[PDB]
Symmetry: D2
Subunit: 256 residues, 4 copies
């Protein structure tokens, strides 16, 4: 049997690491991307080279916008992401909401503020919700007899959002939304044995505040975060749900 | 002169109580509403009867959608940001100031992840996230620009924003995911706005009811075994707005009779 | 006519709380350990403004047995629980009631996990007892005694606004380096706030916390380093005044707050929102 | 080559599972106990049978009281909690020359209501509940840290880890268990404080908080079923392993960027309301 994982924003950095980690545990991986076509396909080739038919790639804008062929809504695109797993492998056991846009929306000093709202809220919060819904329908729609035994959803949150980065309000709001989703989804999907957890990095794979991380005085490596994600997805973590785990080297414990 | 408060969803229940509470402390009140025209105007008449020119009513859909221009009809021109800016502007146009903002307006209804039609998900998403999170952000932006745009010598001395949050969102109501998500966003806004607006001395706080003015659920509340009254919530909002609370910012105050301390 | 007991009431925030409560019409039992002069001076002020509106009681709130006397000798020794029961009693003996309790008294000093990487079993066995006593254990026994006197009053002769306030700390999730026992104690105090709110709800006794960030900071340091510490608070770039904290305590004690219980209110100018 | 773990309250249930779990990853285990001598020595024999010299069992009251020093009617006398704690950690260094992991698992748990010669049960409840759950962990952590600091950087281990067994439900307190709840609150504080202070020594300090685990069935079957079914996930309390596997993961080098955090292992129980 092969378990299947869908990882959004899978092409580089943390998403890559999560994809690789899950693959190393024997998962077939659906690598989602938006712009990073080259890196996603390059990664898929690597995984497929180690293990045939263990990686595909699909493309999607997770921004809260309808596109063009009815233009196509964000819900439709999200449903089609999950479907891509079922079409290709007949299952989807793990979902990782990792894709996330991150840039300033200052309150102090209007078209590019239309699209900021749709992008930052789409990637970080709205799309995750629709992805979860699609994920949950597919599971519910499978007869109990042929359901998987380790359904897990991980939401990439942020360990530092209680201590907001100055000027990043929409982003912080979006992560707040995502934490809400983690709790709400965990509660509603418990009957289907679908676990919903969060993982929140502090500082990871940077390119300043490096020296202010108490443990090691450095940002983390990609693996230092993905290993937590992978652990939470393992059956060892089968009683954990609705919780967020900080992977931040004690950064959230600091003050100015 | 007279301090001015903008209160969204002001027509009934908690928003009305907040409006009344603020008015009782001497504030002029801009009462926002969406469809409760009758109850908003009725309230404005009451306040204006008690004190001339101390209340106006303004109408706005705070959903994350477009509305029509002049003599037209909807999904066209007027954005949520524009409508929000015009709400804050209405205070400055009428009274020349806006000292307090209360983000109270909020849609609340089920969005189940488990079925157990096509626009349903679109308009729920825009409404629940608009009222509860997006509009509050734009309202705060508009609020902040106006304060920033006033020359220092001419600014008020007690700028306060209150966000109606939810004391129970860490223990989510089954099937209310988008709503819970939206309140989560609102909490983030509270913290983020408090930090960014601190230099302008604008305070940003949350108030979170548990159960208030219910139309045994009550019997579950540890203290008194009842939902709260409107005043039991608005008095907290009003206190946080007072100058005695001038060192409080970026915090959420539960007003829940100890409901959040319970478990199944 | 309503009565308040305020521990550590002689100076600073405790003084402000006492004054604030007194200004709302409360009779105030001012508790002190070390500050006799400053407590009696305050009591005289309050009594001058309003006759019989202030008394002073002395007690070490450290988790130690302290024997029959402050001079003579022995019989059986006096536990912390006894001392705490006698504090609450002092209110009932003098005024026949105790409507509000404010656990404000608190010791605060370093207990480093590491040395450099003198000390004894004394400074150690007494730091634990003092920091945990003042901040957590005594509050628990105070609350017990408070709750027993309320429960023991026939429903007809009970007050209508019973309130307990626990002075917590807004910054304990971002611990001050080297202050572990103190932080642990505040952690314990937070727990007490939740647990007591739940258990005392049926008697309509509300239990809430107030947590300062930086308040009435002491300048036993260079002016620039004082300016240094002040300016990291986002709101106003200063520590708070005593009133800025006490007004919150007083509001939570008012009937206007009678649906709030089991919550902690930071009063910190957004300091808890910062990071290194 | 062999990493060493100290586990307090190791004799059964969760502590045993943690001990077994750590032993399965190759740790030598110092099993602590207070009252459960038989169970602790039985477990030690098991571990030692699977791998020689991979388990010892030390005895200690972690209550906040001073004990008497093996006696001899002479020699000052009062052994403080701090001393007993230092001697626990020392026992690892004496026997194996190291101590890489500490698990503060030992915990007394019983009612201290605020309503309704036993001054005796107020003093001793306070010392026991606060000792086991908070004070002793503090001294244990101190001893642990002093001993790492005292090692020349050259010989230090590379995966120092402290786990504190907390409680996922303490924000929603169990009626009548105030001291216990306060004690867990203290423990949470310790986790944060110790993480911050011990970061320079690369000692990680984390919490693991169960909701319901291996629920004692001393009630009507249906009362047990009732409580049981309050957990959203699976409608049951956890198994010991379902908790210890989390402890063991946090101790692994794959978790070496995690510090100062508490991980709920509660099947979503903390998400419920009355
Ligand atoms: N890096 C950190 O220190 C840090 C700190 C806290 C939290 N996190 C969280 O951890 C996760 C991963 O971190 P990261 O730094 O690796 O992320 P990242 O480098 O900033 O980007 C993640 C991916 O998100 C995708 N994405 C962004 N907007 C999208 C949109 N509108 N539609 C579809 N895809 C979109 C991008 O895909 P394409 O390139 O294919 O377009 C991008 O590769 C994120 O959720 C982040 O919020 C990271
Ligand atoms: N009631 C409770 O027990 C409870 C519990 C937790 C939190 N809260 C929070 O406390 C606040 C007030 O509670 P409540 O029960 O008084 O609220 P409510 O009765 O449900 O309604 C508040 C107002 O929000 C306005 N509104 C809703 N959607 C809108 C939209 N899309 N655009 C513009 N206005 C919109 C409505 O105005 P119109 O009628 O004029 O259209 C409504 O009167 C809310 O933020 C709520 O989330 C309440
Ligand atoms: N000041 C701040 O910025 C700050 C920050 C966070 C939290 N807080 C909290 O707010 C409360 C008041 O703050 P503060 O700065 O005004 O307090 P403070 O000046 O440090 O002292 C409070 C009082 O506690 C009493 N006290 C200390 N140990 C005692 C003991 N073992 N037994 C009996 N009484 C004892 C002392 O009374 P005597 O002088 O009579 O001996 C002292 O005057 C405290 O709970 C504190 O933890 C304050
Ligand atoms: N079980 C749960 O559902 C649950 C829920 C939440 C949190 N937890 C936490 O998880 C941990 C383990 O749970 P558990 O149920 O396995 O614990 P447990 O059965 O209640 O006992 C743990 C051990 O602690 C030791 N202990 C108690 N008081 C002591 C003292 N004063 N001095 C020295 N040792 C003492 C006992 O050792 P001896 O028998 O050798 O005397 C006991 O075996 C505890 O920290 C607990 O607080 C458990
Ligand atoms: N430091 C940093 C770099 C990139 C990031 N990307 C996303 N999506 N979110 C972050 N918080 C982030 C942080
Ligand atoms: N019980 C109840 C009734 C009405 C409500 N309205 C809003 N907007 N939000 C609520 N949480 C709510 C709750
Ligand atoms: N029981 C007893 C007998 C004699 C004592 N003498 C002093 N000085 N102090 C005591 N506590 C004492 C007690
Ligand atoms: N800065 C400061 C000064 C005095 C204090 N006293 C107590 N008791 N607690 C504090 N946190 C404190 C802080
Ligand atoms: N249910 C249960 C059983 C035993 C326990 N032991 C300790 N020490 N702590 C608990 N919370 C506990 C809970």
């Amino acid at each position: 049997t092969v378990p299947v994982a869908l990882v959004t924003g899978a092409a580089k950095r943390l998403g890559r690491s999560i994809a690789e980690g899950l693959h190393a545990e024997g998962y077939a991986v659906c690598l989602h991307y938006h712009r990073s076509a080259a890196e996603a396909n390059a990664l898929s080739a690597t995984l497929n080279a180690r293990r045939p038919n263990s990686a595909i790639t699909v493309q999607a804008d997770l921004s809260n916008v309808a596109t063009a062929p009815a233009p196509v809504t964000l819900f439709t695109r999200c449903a089609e992401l999950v479907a891509a797993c079922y079409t290709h492998w007949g299952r989807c056991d793990v979902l990782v909401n990792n894709a996330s846009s991150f840039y300033p929306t200052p309150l102090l000093r209007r078209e590019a503020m239309e699209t900021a709202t749709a992008d930052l809220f789409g990637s970080n919060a709205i799309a995750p919700y629709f992805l979860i819904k699609a994920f949950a329908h597919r599971v519910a729609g499978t007869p109990a007899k042929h359901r998987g035994t380790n359904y897990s959803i991980i939401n990439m949150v942020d360990a530092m959002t209680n201590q907001p980065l100055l000027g990043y309000t929409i982003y912080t709001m979006a992560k707040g939304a995502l934490e809400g989703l983690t709790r709400s989804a965990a509660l509603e999907l418990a009957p289907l044995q679908i676990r919903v957890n969060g993982v929140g990095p502090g500082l990871s794979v940077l390119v300043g505040h490096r020296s202010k991380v108490p443990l090691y005085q450095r940002d983390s490596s990609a693996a230092e975060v993905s290993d937590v994600v992978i652990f939470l997805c393992s059956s060892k973590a089968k009683y954990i749900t609705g919780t967020c785990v900080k992977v931040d080297g004690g950064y959230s414990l600091t003050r100015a």
